[PDB]
Amino acid sequence: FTDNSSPPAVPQSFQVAHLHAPTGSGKSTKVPAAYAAQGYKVLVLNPSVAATLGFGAYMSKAHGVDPNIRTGVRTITTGSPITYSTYGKFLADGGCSGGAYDIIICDECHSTDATSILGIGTVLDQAETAGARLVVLATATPPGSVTVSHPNIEEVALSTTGEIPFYGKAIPLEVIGRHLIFCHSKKKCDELAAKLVALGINAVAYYRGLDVSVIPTNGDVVVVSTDALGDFDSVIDCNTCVTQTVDFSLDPTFTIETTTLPQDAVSRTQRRGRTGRGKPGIYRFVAPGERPSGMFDSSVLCECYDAGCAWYELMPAETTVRLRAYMNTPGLPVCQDHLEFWEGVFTGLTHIDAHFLSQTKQSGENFPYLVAYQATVCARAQAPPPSWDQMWKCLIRLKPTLHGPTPLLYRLGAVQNEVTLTHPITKYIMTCMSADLEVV
Amino acid sequence: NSSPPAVPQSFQVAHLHAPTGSGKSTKVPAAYAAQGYKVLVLNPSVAATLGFGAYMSKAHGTGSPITYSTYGKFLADGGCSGGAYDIIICDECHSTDATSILGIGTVLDQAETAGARLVVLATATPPGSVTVSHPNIEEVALSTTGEIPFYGKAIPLEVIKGGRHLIFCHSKKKCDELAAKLVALGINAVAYYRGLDVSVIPTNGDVVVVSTDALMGDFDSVIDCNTCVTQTVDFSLDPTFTIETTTLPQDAVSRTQRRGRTGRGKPGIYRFVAPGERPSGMFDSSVLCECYDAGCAWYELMPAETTVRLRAYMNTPGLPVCQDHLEFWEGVFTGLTHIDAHFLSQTKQSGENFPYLVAYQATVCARAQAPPPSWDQMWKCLIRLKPTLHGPTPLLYRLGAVQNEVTLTHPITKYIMTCMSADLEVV
Ligand SMILES: COc1ccc([N+](=O)[O-])cc1Cn1cc(CC(=O)O)c2ccc(-c3cc(N)cc(N)c3)cc21
Ligand SMILES: [Ca+2]
Ligand SMILES: [Ca+2]
C-alpha cells in the first residue's frame, strides 16, 4: 500500500496504491491515458453509468481514443488498451478475468453504495491472481476528509430573518435568477415548491421518480431538490441527508429504515459544487458543520449480500471473501464488521421462489432477494405479505394467501398485517444475531 | 491554525490545532499571561495528563494571571463572571461528553458580554482527524492464525507468552472470557474494568492485562479490538424514545489513546483487528438530552437557557457535530413539570445518568401509585413500594429494560410523542 498525490509508477510486482487527487486532474482520463501511453492495458471502474459512458465520449472527442465501454445498458468493444466500466458491470462480468488488465483503477473509491464496495472488494481479492501489476484506489475525498473553501464560491451563514422558514433558519425574500435548494425529503420539496409557486416564484421540485426533463433548461428558476440530481447562481443547503440504516430491533430480528443525519463532507462539497462552475457562485447553509467522510452503515453490507445472491450468483461465503478483502485494506471507508452475521442470514435463506426474485429484480426494489424471500415464505405458508405496499406486488394473487398472520422474518418497511414470530427462518435469523453480533 | 492566535482588537473566536505535543494548557496560556492578560483555561479535568504529578490548578503551575479549571466547575460556578478574564482557552474541545459540550457552549454564548477579547478552541484532534503513525510504535495486523480467537481474528500465543501486554476488549464480559482462556493456557492474565483498581500487578513480572477503557505500569505491546461501546438514543415509538448502549468501531481519539499505552520510552508493538477507524467529530442526540437533564438537575437552567448555550455551540464552525434536536429536547423537558424534589435529590446523589429523567418517571409512578418499569437499582427511590405495586407502569420513555407491563396513556407520554412528530420527523 502507498499514498500518492501523483500517478504511481507501475511497479515490478503487485501493489495497491492510494491516489488522492483533485477531480479536475483527470483521475479517470489523464491518469489512464498516461498509463495507456506506456503500453499498459487499463481498467477504469466508476459507480455511475453516466460517468462511465461520459468518459468514453470525452476521450473520443478530445483525443480520438475510443475506449471499450462496459455498462449494464450499453457495451462497446473497440480493443483499446483503455476500458471504462461500472462497478456493477464489472461484477456481472465475473470480476477479474485472468490476463486482461495490467492496471485497475478503482475511481471514486470513497463511494459507499453497495456496488462500489463489493466491486472494490472483488478487485482487491482477485487482481493479483488475475495478473494485474497495479491497483489504484482513487478519490478526491479520502476517509476523514472535510470540506475546504472554494476560491470561486461565496459561503454565507444563514440566519433567522426571512419570509420563509428554512430548517430553523430563514430564506429571505431577495436572493431567489437561477438557484438550487437542497431539502432532505421529497415531501419538503413539494411543500416548499408549492409555497414558492404560490409566492409567484417559478419553483419546481425534483426527486427520484420524477424525470429531469421537468427541470427548466435555463431561464430564471428556483429548483428545490433532494440529492437525486446546468448550473446556478447560488446553492441553498439544509445540510442534512436521509440515509439507510439497520436497526437490530429484535421485533423479531432487524429493521431496514432511514435516518436524517448531518451531511458528511462528500455531500456538502457536491451540493456546494453545483454552483461556482467558472462564474463566481454563492453558498448558503443552515449549519456550519459536517460529518467527516469515511463511514458507512451495516445495512450496506446487507445490500452486498442481497446483490451477490440476486444479481451475481455469489454464495454468501464468496461475497464474504470479497468484502473481507475490502475491510482488510487500509485507507478505505469503514463500517461495523458484520460480515459473519449477514453471511449467516443469507445462507439460511434457501429455495427462494425464482419467479418472485425475477419480479423484485425487475421492479427495482431495494433488497430484491430479501423481499422475494419473505414473499416466498408468505406464499408457502399461504399467509399475507407484511403489507400491501407495492413492495409486495408479486403476491397480488392475494385471494388465497390471506390466511392470517404474517410469518415475519424481518422489517423492510411498515408492517400492517398481524404477524407471527415463530417461523424457523425467523428463529434462524435470531440465532444468527446471538451468534454473530457483539453484545453490550 | 498551528500556533497561538494573536489577541484581536474586537472579540473573536479562534481555533488552535496544536500538535499532539506542545501543550495548549501549559505553554500557550503562559505566553498570553506574559502580555498582561488574565487567562482562563478549561479542560475536562485538571489532573495531570500523565496520570501522575501536580494538578494543573496548583499555585505556580494564586493571584496568578492564569486560572486552570474544568468545564464542570465552570458550569457549577454559573459560567462567565463579568470582567474576570481577557482570554478563555477551551482546551480539548473535541470532547463530546455533555459537560464539555454545555461548558464550551456557555463560554461561546457568554464570553463577549463578560468582556473577554478572545476565545481559543484548542485540540490536538480537530474534526476529521485520523490516527497518524508513531515513530516509536510498530503496528501489525492480526491474522486468522493463532490459538486465541479475538474478534474474528486470532492472537498467536507467542506474541504474548512472556513479556507485559495490554489487550482492549469492548466489555467486561469479554475481558473475563478472554482472561479465562489465557489463564487456561498458562498465561498470567488479569482482567481490568470499572470497579477493580489494583489487581493489575504493580510488579513488572510477565502479565497480560485484559481491559476496557476504564484503565488509568507500562507495556511491551497493545492488542486492540478497535471497537467501543457508546450511548445512543433510539426514536423507537414504543411509546417514545430509548436511551441504549451500542457497539461501534473506535474513532481516532480512542485508537490513538489505546495504541499510546505502549511505546512509552522503549519501542512498542500495536496489533489490531481493523486497519481503520471512524473519523472524529460527531456525537449522538442523547448527549443533547444529557445537557438538558443536567441543566434542569444541576445548573438551575431553564430549558431555553440550555438551548441558547447549545445553539451557540452549534453555530460555531470547527466543533463536533450532532443532529439539530434542540427544539425537540427543549420541548420534552418543558413538559416535565412538578417533578418530586425528593426523588430528584436521590437520583442526583446516586450518580445515575439522566437523574432528571429517572426521577421524573418515578414521580409519575408515585402519583398514579404504579410500579417502576423494573426494579433495577435505577428505580430505588421508589423502594417504599408496597403501595405502588398496583398496575401497569405509565411508561414515558425507556431508560433501561422494562419488565413490568405498561400503559401508554399518560398525558406526558402523549405530549412527548407529539414533540417527536412535530419537532423531529419521527411520527
Ligand atoms: C439495479 O441493479 C443493481 C442494483 C444494486 C446492485 N448492488 O447493490 O450491488 C447491483 C445491481 C446490478 N447491476 C448494477 C450494474 C451497473 C450498471 O447498470 O452498469 C449492472 C450491470 C450489469 C448487470 C447484469 C447484467 C446481465 N446481463 C446479467 C446479470 N446477472 C447482471 C447487473 C448490474
Ligand atoms: Ca432499537
Ligand atoms: Ca431505530
PDB file of C-alpha atoms and ligand atoms in Angstrom, chain A residues 247-250 257, chain B residues 234 236 242 244, ligand 2:
ATOM      1  CA  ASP A 247     -31.718  -1.342  13.435  1.00  0.00           C
ATOM      2  CA  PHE A 248     -31.245  -4.625  15.292  1.00  0.00           C
ATOM      3  CA  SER A 249     -34.669  -4.116  16.739  1.00  0.00           C
ATOM      4  CA  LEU A 250     -35.419  -7.696  17.843  1.00  0.00           C
ATOM      5  CA  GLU A 257     -35.102   2.092   7.923  1.00  0.00           C
TER       6      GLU A 257
ATOM      7  CA  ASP B 234     -33.321   5.359  19.635  1.00  0.00           C
ATOM      8  CA  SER B 236     -38.461   3.782  18.780  1.00  0.00           C
ATOM      9  CA  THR B 242     -34.918   4.744  24.141  1.00  0.00           C
ATOM     10  CA  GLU B 244     -29.416   2.449  24.873  1.00  0.00           C
TER      11      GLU B 244
HETATM   12 CA    CA C   2     -33.848  -0.169  18.524  1.00  0.00          CA
END
